[PDB]
């Protein structure tokens, strides 16, 4: 399966993008919680 082997970098990049978005959202959520505490 050459197709999946060629698309594996794309899948890895998409997973990296998703992890970046999820981490950013968790970071922003904690910042919002600190804002509400204030």
């Amino acid at each position: 399966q050459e197709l999946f082997n060629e698309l594996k970098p794309a899948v890895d990049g998409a997973n990296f993008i998703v992890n970046h978005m999820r981490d950013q959202n968790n970071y922003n959520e904690e910042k919002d919680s600190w804002n509400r505490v204030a």
Binding site: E6, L7, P9, A10, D12, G13, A14, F16, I17, H20
Partner: peptide, 24 residues
């Protein structure tokens, strides 16, 4: 399959930019 190659290049560029932002 130029379309899939272009998609892979775009995704790799997006990941590279986000990694650069992470290091910064």
């Amino acid at each position: 399959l130029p379309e899939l190659r272009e998609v892979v290049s775009s995704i790799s560029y997006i990941a590279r930019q986000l990694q650069e932002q992470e290091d910064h």
